[PDB]
Coordinates of C-alpha atoms and ligand atoms in Angstrom, one line a residue:
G1 CA 5.2 -28.7 134.0
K2 CA 6.7 -25.7 132.1
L3 CA 10.4 -25.0 132.5
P4 CA 11.3 -21.4 133.5
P5 CA 12.0 -18.9 130.6
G6 CA 15.4 -17.4 129.7
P7 CA 17.8 -16.2 127.0
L8 CA 18.9 -18.3 124.0
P9 CA 21.1 -21.3 125.0
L10 CA 24.2 -21.6 122.7
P11 CA 25.3 -25.1 121.7
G12 CA 28.7 -25.0 123.4
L13 CA 28.8 -22.3 126.1
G14 CA 25.0 -22.1 126.6
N15 CA 24.3 -18.8 128.4
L16 CA 27.9 -18.1 129.3
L17 CA 27.9 -15.1 127.0
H18 CA 24.7 -13.6 128.4
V19 CA 26.4 -13.1 131.8
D20 CA 29.3 -10.8 132.3
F21 CA 30.3 -12.4 135.6
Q22 CA 31.3 -8.9 136.8
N23 CA 28.3 -7.1 138.2
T24 CA 26.3 -10.3 137.9
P25 CA 23.6 -9.1 140.2
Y26 CA 23.1 -6.1 137.8
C27 CA 22.8 -8.6 134.9
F28 CA 20.3 -10.6 136.8
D29 CA 18.1 -7.5 137.3
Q30 CA 18.0 -7.2 133.5
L31 CA 17.1 -10.9 133.0
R32 CA 14.4 -10.5 135.7
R33 CA 12.9 -7.6 133.9
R34 CA 12.9 -9.6 130.7
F35 CA 11.9 -13.2 131.8
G36 CA 10.4 -12.8 135.3
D37 CA 11.1 -13.7 138.9
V38 CA 12.1 -17.3 138.0
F39 CA 14.3 -17.6 134.9
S40 CA 16.7 -20.3 133.7
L41 CA 20.4 -20.4 132.6
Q42 CA 22.7 -23.0 131.1
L43 CA 26.1 -22.4 132.5
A44 CA 28.2 -25.0 130.7
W45 CA 27.2 -28.5 132.0
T46 CA 25.2 -26.9 134.9
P47 CA 21.5 -26.3 134.7
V48 CA 20.7 -23.1 136.8
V49 CA 17.5 -21.6 138.0
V50 CA 17.6 -18.1 139.5
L51 CA 15.0 -17.1 142.2
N52 CA 14.1 -13.4 142.6
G53 CA 11.9 -11.6 145.1
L54 CA 10.7 -12.8 148.6
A55 CA 7.9 -15.0 147.2
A56 CA 10.0 -17.0 144.8
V57 CA 12.8 -17.4 147.4
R58 CA 10.4 -18.4 150.2
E59 CA 8.6 -20.9 148.0
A60 CA 11.8 -22.8 147.4
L61 CA 13.7 -22.5 150.7
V62 CA 10.7 -22.8 153.1
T63 CA 7.7 -24.4 151.3
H64 CA 9.9 -26.8 149.5
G65 CA 12.7 -26.6 152.0
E66 CA 13.0 -30.4 152.3
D67 CA 13.9 -30.6 148.6
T68 CA 16.1 -27.6 148.3
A69 CA 18.4 -27.9 151.3
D70 CA 21.2 -29.7 149.4
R71 CA 24.5 -28.4 148.1
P72 CA 26.0 -28.7 144.6
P73 CA 28.8 -31.2 144.7
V74 CA 32.3 -29.7 145.0
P75 CA 34.7 -32.6 144.1
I76 CA 38.0 -30.5 144.4
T77 CA 37.5 -30.2 148.2
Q78 CA 38.7 -33.8 148.5
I79 CA 42.2 -32.3 148.3
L80 CA 41.4 -30.6 151.6
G81 CA 40.2 -33.8 153.2
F82 CA 36.5 -33.8 152.4
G83 CA 34.9 -37.2 152.8
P84 CA 31.5 -38.8 153.3
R85 CA 31.3 -38.5 157.1
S86 CA 33.5 -35.3 157.1
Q87 CA 31.9 -32.6 154.9
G88 CA 31.7 -29.9 157.6
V89 CA 28.6 -27.8 157.6
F90 CA 28.8 -25.1 154.9
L91 CA 29.4 -27.3 151.9
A92 CA 28.0 -30.5 153.4
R93 CA 25.5 -32.5 151.4
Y94 CA 21.9 -32.7 152.6
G95 CA 21.8 -35.7 154.9
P96 CA 22.8 -37.1 158.4
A97 CA 26.4 -35.7 158.1
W98 CA 25.1 -32.1 157.6
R99 CA 22.3 -32.3 160.2
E100 CA 24.4 -33.7 163.0
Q101 CA 27.0 -30.9 162.5
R102 CA 24.3 -28.4 162.0
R103 CA 22.4 -29.3 165.2
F104 CA 25.7 -29.4 167.1
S105 CA 26.9 -25.9 166.0
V106 CA 23.5 -24.3 166.6
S107 CA 23.1 -25.7 170.1
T108 CA 26.7 -25.1 171.1
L109 CA 26.5 -21.4 170.2
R110 CA 23.3 -21.3 172.3
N111 CA 24.8 -23.1 175.3
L112 CA 28.0 -21.1 175.4
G113 CA 26.0 -17.9 175.5
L114 CA 23.1 -18.7 177.9
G115 CA 25.2 -20.3 180.6
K116 CA 27.6 -17.5 181.7
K117 CA 27.2 -14.9 178.9
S118 CA 30.6 -16.0 177.6
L119 CA 29.4 -15.2 174.1
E120 CA 28.6 -11.6 175.1
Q121 CA 31.6 -11.4 177.3
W122 CA 34.2 -12.2 174.7
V123 CA 32.6 -9.7 172.3
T124 CA 32.4 -6.9 174.9
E125 CA 36.0 -7.4 175.7
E126 CA 37.0 -7.6 172.1
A127 CA 35.1 -4.3 171.4
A128 CA 37.2 -2.6 174.1
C129 CA 40.4 -3.8 172.3
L130 CA 39.0 -2.6 169.1
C131 CA 38.3 0.8 170.6
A132 CA 41.9 1.0 171.9
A133 CA 43.4 0.0 168.5
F134 CA 41.2 2.8 167.0
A135 CA 42.4 5.2 169.6
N136 CA 46.1 4.8 168.6
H137 CA 45.3 5.9 165.0
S138 CA 43.8 9.2 166.2
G139 CA 45.1 12.3 164.5
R140 CA 45.6 10.4 161.3
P141 CA 43.3 8.9 158.6
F142 CA 43.4 5.1 158.2
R143 CA 41.7 2.1 156.6
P144 CA 39.5 0.5 159.3
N145 CA 39.2 -2.9 157.5
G146 CA 42.2 -4.6 158.9
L147 CA 41.3 -3.9 162.5
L148 CA 37.7 -5.0 161.9
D149 CA 39.0 -8.4 160.6
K150 CA 41.1 -8.9 163.7
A151 CA 38.3 -8.0 166.1
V152 CA 35.8 -10.2 164.3
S153 CA 38.3 -13.0 163.9
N154 CA 39.0 -13.0 167.7
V155 CA 35.3 -13.4 168.5
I156 CA 35.2 -16.6 166.4
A157 CA 38.5 -17.9 167.9
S158 CA 36.9 -17.3 171.3
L159 CA 34.0 -19.6 170.3
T160 CA 36.1 -22.2 168.5
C161 CA 39.3 -22.4 170.5
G162 CA 38.4 -20.4 173.6
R163 CA 41.1 -17.7 173.1
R164 CA 42.0 -14.4 171.4
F165 CA 45.1 -13.3 169.6
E166 CA 47.0 -10.0 170.0
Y167 CA 46.7 -7.8 166.9
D168 CA 50.4 -8.0 166.3
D169 CA 50.6 -11.8 166.7
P170 CA 52.7 -13.3 163.8
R171 CA 50.6 -16.4 163.6
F172 CA 47.4 -14.4 163.8
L173 CA 48.3 -12.1 160.9
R174 CA 49.4 -15.1 158.8
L175 CA 46.2 -16.9 159.6
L176 CA 44.2 -13.9 158.5
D177 CA 46.2 -13.2 155.4
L178 CA 45.9 -16.9 154.3
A179 CA 42.2 -16.7 154.9
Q180 CA 41.5 -13.7 152.6
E181 CA 43.6 -15.2 149.8
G182 CA 41.6 -18.5 150.3
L183 CA 38.5 -16.5 149.6
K184 CA 39.9 -15.3 146.2
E185 CA 40.8 -18.9 145.3
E186 CA 37.1 -19.9 145.7
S187 CA 36.3 -17.0 143.3
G188 CA 38.5 -18.3 140.4
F189 CA 37.6 -19.3 136.9
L190 CA 40.0 -22.2 137.3
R191 CA 37.8 -23.6 140.0
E192 CA 34.6 -24.1 137.9
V193 CA 36.5 -25.9 135.1
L194 CA 38.3 -28.0 137.7
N195 CA 35.0 -28.6 139.5
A196 CA 33.6 -30.1 136.3
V197 CA 36.1 -33.0 135.9
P198 CA 37.8 -34.5 139.0
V199 CA 40.5 -36.6 137.2
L200 CA 42.0 -33.3 136.1
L201 CA 43.2 -33.2 139.7
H202 CA 45.2 -36.3 139.2
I203 CA 47.9 -34.2 137.5
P204 CA 50.4 -33.4 140.3
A205 CA 51.3 -30.0 138.9
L206 CA 47.6 -28.9 138.6
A207 CA 46.5 -30.3 141.9
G208 CA 49.1 -28.3 143.8
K209 CA 48.2 -24.9 142.4
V210 CA 44.4 -25.4 142.9
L211 CA 44.2 -24.6 146.6
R212 CA 47.7 -23.6 147.7
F213 CA 46.5 -20.8 150.0
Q214 CA 43.5 -22.8 151.2
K215 CA 45.8 -25.7 152.1
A216 CA 48.1 -23.2 153.9
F217 CA 45.2 -22.0 156.0
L218 CA 44.2 -25.5 157.1
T219 CA 47.8 -26.4 157.8
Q220 CA 48.1 -23.2 160.0
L221 CA 44.8 -24.1 161.6
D222 CA 45.9 -27.6 162.3
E223 CA 48.9 -26.3 164.3
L224 CA 46.5 -24.2 166.4
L225 CA 44.1 -27.1 166.9
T226 CA 46.9 -29.4 168.0
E227 CA 48.0 -26.8 170.6
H228 CA 44.4 -26.5 171.8
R229 CA 44.1 -30.3 172.2
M230 CA 47.0 -30.2 174.6
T231 CA 45.4 -27.7 177.0
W232 CA 41.9 -29.3 176.9
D233 CA 40.7 -30.5 180.3
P234 CA 38.0 -33.2 179.8
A235 CA 37.2 -33.2 183.5
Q236 CA 35.6 -29.8 183.1
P237 CA 32.6 -28.6 181.0
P238 CA 33.7 -27.5 177.5
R239 CA 34.9 -23.9 177.4
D240 CA 34.5 -23.7 173.6
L241 CA 33.1 -25.4 170.6
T242 CA 36.2 -27.4 169.8
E243 CA 36.2 -28.9 173.4
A244 CA 32.5 -29.7 173.0
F245 CA 33.4 -31.3 169.7
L246 CA 36.3 -33.3 171.3
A247 CA 34.0 -34.5 174.0
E248 CA 31.6 -35.9 171.4
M249 CA 34.5 -37.5 169.5
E250 CA 35.4 -39.6 172.6
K251 CA 31.8 -40.8 172.9
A252 CA 31.7 -41.6 169.2
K253 CA 34.8 -43.9 169.3
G254 CA 33.8 -47.2 167.7
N255 CA 31.1 -45.5 165.6
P256 CA 31.8 -45.2 161.9
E257 CA 28.4 -43.5 161.4
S258 CA 29.3 -40.4 163.4
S259 CA 30.6 -37.2 161.8
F260 CA 32.5 -36.5 165.0
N261 CA 36.1 -37.4 163.9
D262 CA 39.4 -35.7 163.4
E263 CA 39.0 -35.1 159.7
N264 CA 35.7 -33.3 160.3
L265 CA 36.9 -31.2 163.3
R266 CA 39.4 -29.2 161.2
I267 CA 36.8 -28.8 158.5
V268 CA 33.9 -27.7 160.7
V269 CA 36.2 -25.3 162.6
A270 CA 37.6 -23.9 159.3
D271 CA 34.0 -23.4 158.2
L272 CA 32.9 -21.5 161.3
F273 CA 36.1 -19.5 161.4
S274 CA 36.1 -18.3 157.8
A275 CA 32.3 -17.8 157.3
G276 CA 31.9 -15.6 160.4
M277 CA 35.1 -13.6 159.8
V278 CA 34.8 -12.1 156.3
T279 CA 31.0 -11.5 156.5
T280 CA 30.8 -9.8 159.9
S281 CA 33.9 -7.7 159.2
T282 CA 32.7 -6.5 155.8
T283 CA 29.3 -5.5 157.3
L284 CA 31.1 -3.5 160.0
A285 CA 33.2 -2.0 157.2
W286 CA 30.0 -1.0 155.3
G287 CA 28.6 0.4 158.6
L288 CA 31.5 2.7 159.1
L289 CA 31.4 3.9 155.5
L290 CA 27.7 4.7 155.8
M291 CA 28.4 6.7 159.0
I292 CA 30.8 9.0 157.4
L293 CA 28.6 9.4 154.3
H294 CA 25.6 10.2 156.5
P295 CA 26.9 12.1 159.6
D296 CA 23.3 13.1 160.5
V297 CA 22.5 9.4 161.0
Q298 CA 25.7 9.0 163.0
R299 CA 24.7 11.8 165.4
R300 CA 21.2 10.4 166.0
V301 CA 22.7 7.0 166.9
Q302 CA 25.2 8.6 169.2
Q303 CA 22.3 10.6 170.7
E304 CA 20.3 7.4 171.4
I305 CA 23.5 5.8 172.8
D306 CA 23.8 8.6 175.4
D307 CA 20.1 8.6 176.3
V308 CA 20.2 4.9 177.0
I309 CA 23.8 3.8 177.8
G310 CA 26.0 6.8 178.4
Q311 CA 29.7 7.2 177.5
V312 CA 31.4 5.2 180.3
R313 CA 29.3 2.0 180.6
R314 CA 29.9 -0.7 178.1
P315 CA 26.9 -1.6 175.8
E316 CA 24.9 -4.8 176.5
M317 CA 22.5 -6.9 174.5
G318 CA 19.8 -5.9 176.9
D319 CA 20.1 -2.3 175.7
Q320 CA 19.1 -3.2 172.1
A321 CA 15.4 -3.6 173.1
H322 CA 15.6 0.1 174.2
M323 CA 17.4 1.4 171.2
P324 CA 15.1 1.2 168.2
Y325 CA 16.9 3.8 166.0
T326 CA 20.3 2.1 166.4
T327 CA 18.7 -1.2 165.6
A328 CA 17.2 0.3 162.4
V329 CA 20.6 1.7 161.3
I330 CA 22.3 -1.6 161.8
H331 CA 19.6 -3.5 159.9
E332 CA 19.8 -0.8 157.1
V333 CA 23.5 -1.3 156.9
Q334 CA 23.0 -5.0 156.2
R335 CA 20.2 -4.2 153.8
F336 CA 22.0 -1.5 151.9
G337 CA 25.4 -3.3 152.2
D338 CA 23.9 -6.4 150.6
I339 CA 27.2 -8.2 151.1
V340 CA 26.0 -11.6 149.8
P341 CA 23.9 -10.6 146.8
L342 CA 23.5 -14.1 145.2
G343 CA 23.6 -15.9 148.6
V344 CA 25.0 -19.4 148.7
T345 CA 24.0 -21.8 145.9
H346 CA 21.5 -24.5 146.7
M347 CA 20.5 -27.7 144.8
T348 CA 17.2 -29.5 144.3
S349 CA 17.3 -33.1 145.7
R350 CA 13.8 -33.7 144.1
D351 CA 11.5 -32.3 141.5
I352 CA 9.7 -29.1 142.8
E353 CA 7.4 -26.4 141.6
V354 CA 8.3 -22.7 142.0
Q355 CA 5.9 -20.0 140.8
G356 CA 4.1 -22.5 138.6
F357 CA 7.2 -23.6 136.8
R358 CA 8.9 -27.0 137.3
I359 CA 12.4 -27.5 138.6
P360 CA 14.1 -30.8 137.8
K361 CA 16.0 -32.7 140.5
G362 CA 19.7 -31.9 140.6
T363 CA 19.1 -28.3 139.5
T364 CA 21.4 -25.6 140.9
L365 CA 19.4 -23.0 142.6
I366 CA 20.5 -19.4 143.0
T367 CA 18.8 -17.3 145.7
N368 CA 19.0 -13.7 144.5
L369 CA 19.0 -12.2 148.0
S370 CA 19.8 -8.8 146.4
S371 CA 16.5 -8.8 144.6
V372 CA 14.8 -9.2 148.0
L373 CA 16.7 -6.6 150.0
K374 CA 16.5 -4.1 147.1
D375 CA 12.9 -4.9 146.0
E376 CA 11.3 -1.6 144.8
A377 CA 7.8 -2.9 145.6
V378 CA 8.7 -3.6 149.2
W379 CA 11.2 -0.8 150.3
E380 CA 10.4 2.9 150.2
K381 CA 13.7 3.9 148.6
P382 CA 15.7 0.7 148.1
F383 CA 18.7 2.2 146.5
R384 CA 19.3 4.7 149.3
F385 CA 20.7 4.5 152.8
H386 CA 17.4 5.0 154.7
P387 CA 17.2 3.9 158.4
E388 CA 13.4 4.6 158.3
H389 CA 13.0 1.3 156.3
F390 CA 13.0 -0.3 159.7
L391 CA 11.0 2.5 161.5
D392 CA 7.4 3.6 161.7
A393 CA 6.2 7.2 162.1
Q394 CA 6.3 6.8 165.9
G395 CA 9.9 5.6 165.9
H396 CA 9.3 1.9 166.7
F397 CA 11.6 -0.7 165.1
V398 CA 9.9 -2.8 162.5
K399 CA 11.4 -5.7 160.6
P400 CA 9.9 -6.3 157.1
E401 CA 9.6 -9.8 155.8
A402 CA 12.0 -8.9 153.0
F403 CA 14.9 -8.6 155.4
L404 CA 16.7 -11.8 154.4
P405 CA 20.5 -11.1 154.5
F406 CA 20.9 -14.5 156.2
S407 CA 18.7 -16.3 153.5
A408 CA 15.9 -18.6 154.7
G409 CA 15.0 -22.2 155.4
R410 CA 17.0 -25.1 156.8
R411 CA 20.3 -23.9 155.4
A412 CA 19.8 -20.3 156.6
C413 CA 22.9 -18.8 158.4
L414 CA 23.5 -20.6 161.7
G415 CA 25.7 -17.7 162.7
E416 CA 23.0 -15.1 162.7
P417 CA 22.5 -15.0 166.5
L418 CA 26.2 -14.3 166.9
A419 CA 26.3 -11.9 164.0
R420 CA 23.5 -9.9 165.6
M421 CA 25.5 -9.7 168.8
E422 CA 28.8 -8.8 167.1
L423 CA 27.1 -6.1 165.0
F424 CA 25.2 -4.4 167.9
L425 CA 28.1 -4.5 170.4
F426 CA 30.9 -3.5 168.0
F427 CA 28.9 -0.8 166.2
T428 CA 27.6 0.9 169.4
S429 CA 30.9 0.7 171.2
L430 CA 32.7 2.4 168.3
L431 CA 30.1 5.2 168.0
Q432 CA 30.0 5.5 171.7
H433 CA 33.6 6.6 171.9
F434 CA 34.4 7.9 168.4
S435 CA 33.1 10.4 165.9
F436 CA 33.8 9.2 162.3
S437 CA 34.2 11.5 159.3
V438 CA 35.7 11.7 155.8
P439 CA 39.3 12.9 155.8
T440 CA 39.5 16.5 154.4
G441 CA 41.4 16.7 151.1
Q442 CA 40.0 13.3 150.1
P443 CA 37.1 12.6 147.7
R444 CA 33.8 11.4 149.0
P445 CA 34.0 7.6 148.9
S446 CA 31.6 5.8 146.6
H447 CA 28.7 4.0 148.2
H448 CA 29.0 1.4 145.5
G449 CA 30.8 -1.8 146.4
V450 CA 33.3 -4.0 144.5
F451 CA 31.4 -7.1 143.3
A452 CA 32.6 -10.5 144.3
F453 CA 31.0 -13.5 146.0
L454 CA 31.1 -11.2 149.0
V455 CA 30.5 -7.5 148.2
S456 CA 32.9 -5.3 150.2
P457 CA 32.9 -1.5 150.3
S458 CA 35.0 0.5 147.9
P459 CA 38.4 1.2 149.6
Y460 CA 38.2 4.2 151.9
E461 CA 39.9 5.9 154.8
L462 CA 38.4 7.6 157.8
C463 CA 39.2 9.8 160.8
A464 CA 38.2 8.6 164.3
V465 CA 38.2 11.3 166.9
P466 CA 37.4 10.5 170.6
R467 CA 34.6 12.1 172.5
Ligands
LIG1 C1 26.7 -10.3 158.7 C2 27.0 -11.6 158.9 C3 26.6 -12.8 158.1 C4 25.8 -12.9 157.0 C5 25.2 -11.8 156.2 C6 25.7 -14.3 156.6 C7 25.0 -14.8 155.5 C8 24.9 -16.1 155.2 C9 24.2 -16.7 154.0 C10 23.5 -15.9 152.9 C11 24.3 -18.0 154.1 C12 23.7 -19.0 153.1 C13 22.4 -19.6 153.6 C14 21.8 -20.5 152.6 O1 22.6 -21.4 152.1 O2 20.6 -20.5 152.3 C15 25.0 -18.4 155.3 C16 25.3 -19.6 155.7 C17 26.2 -20.0 156.7 N1 26.8 -19.1 157.6 FE1 26.5 -17.0 157.7 N2 26.4 -15.0 157.5 C18 27.0 -14.2 158.5 C19 27.8 -14.5 159.6 C20 28.1 -15.8 159.9 C21 28.7 -16.2 161.2 C22 29.0 -15.2 162.3 C23 28.9 -17.5 161.2 C24 29.5 -18.5 162.2 C25 29.8 -18.2 163.5 C26 28.4 -18.0 159.9 C27 28.4 -19.3 159.5 C28 27.6 -19.8 158.5 C29 27.4 -21.3 158.1 C30 28.1 -22.4 158.8 C31 26.6 -21.3 157.1 C32 26.1 -22.6 156.4 C33 24.9 -23.2 157.1 C34 24.4 -24.5 156.4 O3 24.9 -24.7 155.3 O4 23.5 -25.1 157.0 N3 27.9 -16.9 159.2 N4 25.3 -17.2 156.0
LIG2 C1 32.8 -19.0 151.0 C2 33.3 -19.9 152.1 C3 34.7 -19.4 152.6 C4 35.8 -20.3 152.5 C5 37.1 -19.9 152.8 C6 38.2 -20.9 152.8 N1 38.3 -21.8 154.0 C7 39.0 -23.1 153.8 C8 38.0 -24.1 153.2 F1 37.9 -24.0 151.9 F2 38.4 -25.4 153.4 F3 36.8 -24.0 153.8 C9 40.5 -23.2 153.4 C10 40.0 -23.6 154.8 C11 37.3 -18.6 153.3 F4 38.6 -18.3 153.6 C12 36.3 -17.7 153.4 C13 35.0 -18.1 153.0 F5 34.0 -17.2 153.2 C14 32.4 -19.8 153.4 C15 32.9 -20.7 154.5 S1 33.0 -22.4 154.0 C16 33.3 -22.3 152.3 N2 33.5 -23.5 151.7 N3 33.5 -21.2 151.6
LIG3 ZN1 39.5 -24.7 174.8
LIG4 ZN1 4.7 1.9 166.2

């Protein structure tokens, strides 16, 4: 069939000069309005096809989900300990190694939450700690980001290692600091060039600098896992995912086909830890920013909170079904926030057909989630913070098909159920006890975010006054 259209491919750099790599989603909106919803790019040695709009994204990730659930090879991860039967979940190639870890994580999240509401309990308790840390800042403006990271990080640690850390814990702070630096290393120009040719990593000097913060994070994580292995009681049902992983590792002794080994444990845990730490935190940061930029929205949420929950009783997941406006606001935060504009890259394991065009096997697919969440043909006013995007005239919550912040298909975010819980419980608990506003004397903060692989809000301070 016909290959998708696109700008002129230069002999050497290809289409490297047609992309600014800063505000890339803005550049893709220009290419979409010039070549259509499915266009092509030649980024160096890599053939890339960009998918825009709900239809093009669904056609690849759902209709041809079997052929688009693979990941582009990342050779430099071998420094971190990545192997054939130890690829984790996030970067894992499409196959038995991914599916076993995928099915394990999805089911374990489900089991730890349905049995004794341990999922909901750790979040509820962490929200209370978050409220207290907010309370100590009262009377003075502050950046809420750091505290959001800690509260979000603790929820994960509660699911991985069955514990939380105090906000002033030296090892906790270091773990969080190393994590954020490790995100920046994955957004480096040096990475792409090093991803191209592996034997460049044979140079001792180069190999060391590649992932110095990321190796520090794993090392720090190893120390914590070793401690957790000591306190684990195999005679009891698993308290957390790591224990459940350890119990599987024992059963899989003598089986070289299993992905339940030591090398994969530290990688799967590092995956779950990082992925659900910077995403959920950033969203909560967006949520607070939008509440001080739109106080009228904040009051209506606080109104619905009182009419359903009160101001003393802690919020529960059962309350969400009775709070349609608050649900709309949270969904609109994710939509407007749009923290993962280009999603996570996929790769075709076969030849497929998207929107008539043909996509060769081994092609790197980019799902422009931004083009879906901001689609002007779907949303009433896509470039505004508008809670009524998820409400009808009567006030009922509706969820459009175009709400895809967690992407779609087999590779869709496995953390979504937990994310939904963290977002509702943290957001409601904060607004239940605090009124947020812009600090007087300071400029109105921009609703525009700083573009990266993960779009965070422009740096801002806020005032949190108790109620
Ligand atoms: C607001 C919160 C979150 C958002 C918006 C988000 C978004 C995403 C997106 C766009 C993807 C890529 C899906 C694809 O490749 O098609 C993804 C994958 C993933 N996310 Fe999330 N995520 C969030 C929270 C979390 C949490 C809380 C966890 C874990 C507890 C998590 C763990 C993962 C993992 C492991 C994957 C890879 C799944 C796979 O490759 O099969 N994320 N997420
Ligand atoms: C972007 C992401 C990510 C990675 C790290 C780095 N984690 C490491 C990893 F690269 F090994 F995964 C050092 C331990 C973060 F800190 C934050 C992230 F969102 C998502 C989780 S798994 C992955 N490969 N990349
Ligand atoms: Zn444990
Ligand atoms: Zn209705």
